[PDB]
Amino acid sequence: PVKRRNNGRSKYNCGHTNIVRCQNCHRCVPKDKVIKRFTIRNIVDNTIADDVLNACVIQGFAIPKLYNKVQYCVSCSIHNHIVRVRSREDRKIRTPPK
Amino acid sequence: MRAKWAKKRMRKLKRKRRHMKARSK
Amino acid sequence: GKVRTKTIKRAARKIVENNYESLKPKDFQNNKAICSKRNVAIIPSKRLRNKVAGYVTTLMNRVVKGPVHGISLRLQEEERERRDNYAPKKSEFDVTQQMIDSIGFKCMST
RNA sequence: GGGGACGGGUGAAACAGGAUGAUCCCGCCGAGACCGCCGGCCGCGCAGGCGCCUGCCAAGACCGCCUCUGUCAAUCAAGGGCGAAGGCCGGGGGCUAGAAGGCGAUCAGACACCACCGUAUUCCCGGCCGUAAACGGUGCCGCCCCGCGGCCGGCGCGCGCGUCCCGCCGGCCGCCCAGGGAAACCGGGAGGCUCCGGGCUCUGGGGGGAGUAUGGCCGCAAGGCUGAAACUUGAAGGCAUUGACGGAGGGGUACCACCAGACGUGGAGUCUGCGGCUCAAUCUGACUCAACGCGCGCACCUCACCAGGCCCGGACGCGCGGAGGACCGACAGCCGGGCGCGCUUUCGCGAUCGCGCGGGUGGUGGUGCAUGGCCGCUCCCAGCCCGUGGCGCGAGCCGUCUGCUCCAUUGCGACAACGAGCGAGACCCCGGCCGCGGGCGCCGCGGGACGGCCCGCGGCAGCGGGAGGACGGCGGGGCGAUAGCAGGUCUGUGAUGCCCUCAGACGCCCUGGGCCGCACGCGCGCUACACUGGCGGGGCCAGCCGGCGCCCGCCAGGACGCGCGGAGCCCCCGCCGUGGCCGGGACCGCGGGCUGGAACGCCCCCGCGCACCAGGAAUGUCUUGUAGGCGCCCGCCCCCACCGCG
């Protein structure tokens, strides 16, 4: 039967969306059916962050942040645990965890 | 995709049957 | 370390409310003697009695400091009732304008 | 140009790339594709579809409206146009990726997945094709219908005045009251429907055969469209519930699992089972865990098997016969290991009854898949479930928890559940410690310990330590839920259905022999491979629990008596001394004992002196008095343990 009302993709008022490539698996997934998680990590590791600042000659230097959007396919996401198989009731919960 | 592979096998056999009729008539 | 069984736990809660005056909070030996009276509590088995008496001691230290659910303290009950039946003096509670004017009461108007 | 040696690629590699300077860094140039992040429960479009900048050209829905027209409309065979991608036909163009093809791996194979190279293709223009899970798997136009939110576009109302607020209209959505439905779900319908009728078009009628065949039409082709029958079959299918499984996720948990270690097996010589072989017979049971020193010690008996033999122990009841003969016993020879067993024979004895029939009594004979009982296994599990109430048409759920805690549905905090019960715990046996009483003998009754205290951390349940204390957080055992296995036992059983047998016995005995043979394969074990050892004297230490003396014999053992009683290891001093040696003790020739009716059983003395110099691929058990080493007792038992249980 039909597991999900959205059909697993957010396609409303549309017959065709753009094609995105899963970064790990290099597959072609529609834009609506993609993980789309945006991550802002600092350029350096937080273990090496303070010692970089001490070493940095420039005063008032701010460590660069890395801004990237990681998009994955369902197979290339459930296996990396970015999304998890949920209970039928838990599946309905659309709120992001934490 | 057995059902698609079934129609690929069928098309290949109908093509052959056409060739035999082309050899005759 | 060893989780107490429901029979040991339930019995201990009944013993503590019944003998709240008799039991003392931090002494297992004093509480073992109360529990083994064959009057205020009949516990067969030396090991069962020792196990129930030890829960009772833990629960008694909880009763004196921040009491816990399942135990009925007459001493706490009277204080709770006193506040429950306490009257706050003249009651400050005794002492949207368009709505008041709509009723026509116009209380405190101007 | 610079600089110097490895780059690529993977899951790990490898094939190509490199002193003709790769990779890397920077400048610069050419080529074609493509338009990131923003980018969406945004929007637009008839669908297919649509995202660079700057113009140009024509649109479309929506909203507002006291503008015009006056039914001009709805849905639609045929007919027209459009239609992703791939394909095809001409021109181009060619950066990437990449059907084919080629390689390098993988594997049992791999011409697959993965790496690498790369043609068509991908892109544009002019056409063909006419299909997609072209999906909302939901035709179109119309009416009413229940709240609650989000977004988008236009417009109106208040209000200071804000990309507010409240509407309205159109769109896109989420939840959902009824209602519907086989349910999942739909609820802007899949509502207003067995209480059935707004209009219009299309399609289906069990599952195959088969979208096949043939005919038509269409296309350059690929193919599209229209579309059978013969014949076959009893289901195919939908949705949901429960189990089982997952190379699914999240929790846990166990030396029958691993870490970390130990101590082994496998190698060998033996002991001893199992299969195979051979037999007169080698009686059989059973075969992953959960078969294989298991069915409690096979000379006979056991013993169920083989080759001979002996009777009745066939009760009872009837027809018949019958006490001077129903029956039954035998000497001597003879045959026969043998037994009046029979025979020759010629003396005994007394219904102990004969026969026929009907009916027994048996059977270690079969069928454990006909059964009981008992045990093994799932399960060294923690789970199983009831009453009443709730939810569904129901199967079946809730309780019985996806939170935490615990050895553990062990608890706590909750909670359409609310109270219970079983298993867990408690209990029981033992041990260690302390009192009291008793005492031929250490053996009777109690206590002690509970996560109680202390410190941290935790609503809590608990958690980590510190202590004190014989003893510390399940000390070791016994008992063992629920539901099953078509596990095993009919050869333990006056347990037993049914079949077989049933005086030429499958009854029950009696002699002899096998089960113990053995080209071989395998499972427990045992002893070794030595010096931390062997060999000689000396010390001498137990416990479940337990007799001795004296004399002779090399021991083994014996005789004659009586009332009693005790280890190895290790320690100590010698010796041999790295040699298959004095390691090791398999074999094999005399001999001495024992037990029994009888050796083929066991013990012992002098020889004799096998492998094995540390065991491959594999595999098992184990966390303190544990592993391992080292003795000892008991079970079965004439004797006998390399076994089991202690």
Coordinates of C-alpha atoms in Angstrom, one line a residue, chain C:
Chain C
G1 CA 23.1 -2.5 43.8
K2 CA 20.5 -5.3 44.2
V3 CA 17.1 -4.0 43.1
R4 CA 14.5 -4.7 45.8
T5 CA 11.6 -7.1 44.8
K6 CA 8.0 -5.6 44.6
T7 CA 6.9 -7.8 47.6
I8 CA 9.9 -6.4 49.7
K9 CA 9.2 -2.8 48.4
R10 CA 5.4 -2.8 48.8
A11 CA 5.6 -4.4 52.3
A12 CA 8.2 -1.8 53.3
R13 CA 6.0 1.1 52.3
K14 CA 3.1 -0.4 54.4
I15 CA 5.4 -0.9 57.4
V16 CA 6.9 2.7 57.2
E17 CA 3.4 4.4 57.2
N18 CA 2.0 2.1 60.0
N19 CA 5.1 2.4 62.2
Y20 CA 6.4 5.9 61.1
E21 CA 6.6 6.9 64.8
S22 CA 8.2 3.5 65.8
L23 CA 10.9 3.4 63.0
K24 CA 14.1 5.6 63.1
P25 CA 15.8 6.8 59.8
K26 CA 19.5 5.8 59.6
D27 CA 19.6 2.6 61.7
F28 CA 18.9 -0.8 60.1
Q29 CA 19.3 -2.7 63.5
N30 CA 16.7 -0.4 65.3
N31 CA 14.3 -0.8 62.4
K32 CA 14.9 -4.6 62.1
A33 CA 13.7 -4.9 65.7
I34 CA 10.5 -3.0 65.0
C35 CA 9.7 -5.0 61.8
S36 CA 10.3 -8.3 63.6
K37 CA 7.6 -7.8 66.3
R38 CA 5.0 -10.4 64.9
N39 CA 2.5 -7.6 65.7
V40 CA 3.0 -4.4 63.7
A41 CA 4.4 -6.6 60.9
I42 CA 4.6 -10.4 60.4
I43 CA 7.4 -11.3 58.0
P44 CA 8.3 -15.0 57.5
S45 CA 12.0 -15.7 56.6
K46 CA 15.1 -14.2 58.3
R47 CA 16.4 -13.1 54.8
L48 CA 13.1 -11.6 53.8
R49 CA 12.8 -9.7 57.1
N50 CA 16.4 -8.4 56.8
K51 CA 15.7 -7.3 53.1
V52 CA 12.4 -5.5 54.1
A53 CA 14.1 -3.9 57.1
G54 CA 16.9 -2.5 54.9
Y55 CA 14.4 -0.9 52.3
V56 CA 12.5 0.5 55.3
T57 CA 15.7 2.2 56.6
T58 CA 16.4 3.8 53.2
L59 CA 12.7 4.9 52.8
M60 CA 12.8 6.4 56.4
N61 CA 15.7 8.6 55.6
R62 CA 13.7 9.8 52.5
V63 CA 10.6 10.3 54.7
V64 CA 12.3 12.8 57.1
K65 CA 14.0 14.7 54.2
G66 CA 11.9 15.5 51.1
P67 CA 9.2 12.7 51.7
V68 CA 8.2 10.3 48.8
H69 CA 4.9 9.1 47.2
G70 CA 3.0 6.0 48.6
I71 CA 3.7 6.9 52.3
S72 CA 0.9 8.8 54.3
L73 CA 2.4 11.1 57.1
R74 CA -0.2 12.3 59.6
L75 CA 2.3 15.0 60.6
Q76 CA 2.6 16.3 57.1
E77 CA -1.2 15.9 56.5
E78 CA -2.2 18.3 59.3
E79 CA 0.3 21.0 58.1
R80 CA -1.0 20.5 54.4
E81 CA -4.6 20.7 55.7
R82 CA -3.8 23.9 57.7
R83 CA -2.6 25.7 54.5
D84 CA -5.5 24.1 52.4
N85 CA -8.1 25.5 54.9
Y86 CA -6.0 28.7 55.6
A87 CA -7.9 32.0 54.7
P88 CA -5.7 34.8 53.2
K89 CA -7.0 37.7 55.4
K90 CA -9.2 40.3 53.5
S91 CA -8.5 38.4 50.2
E92 CA -6.7 40.7 47.8
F93 CA -8.7 39.0 45.1
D94 CA -11.7 41.0 46.3
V95 CA -10.0 44.3 45.3
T96 CA -11.5 45.6 28.4
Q97 CA -13.1 48.8 29.7
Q98 CA -15.4 48.9 26.6
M99 CA -16.8 45.5 27.6
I100 CA -17.6 46.8 31.2
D101 CA -19.3 49.7 29.6
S102 CA -21.1 47.3 27.2
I103 CA -22.7 45.5 30.2
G104 CA -23.5 49.1 31.3
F105 CA -22.0 48.5 34.8
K106 CA -19.2 51.0 33.9
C107 CA -17.4 50.0 37.2
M108 CA -14.4 52.2 38.0
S109 CA -15.3 54.4 34.9
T110 CA -13.5 57.8 34.5

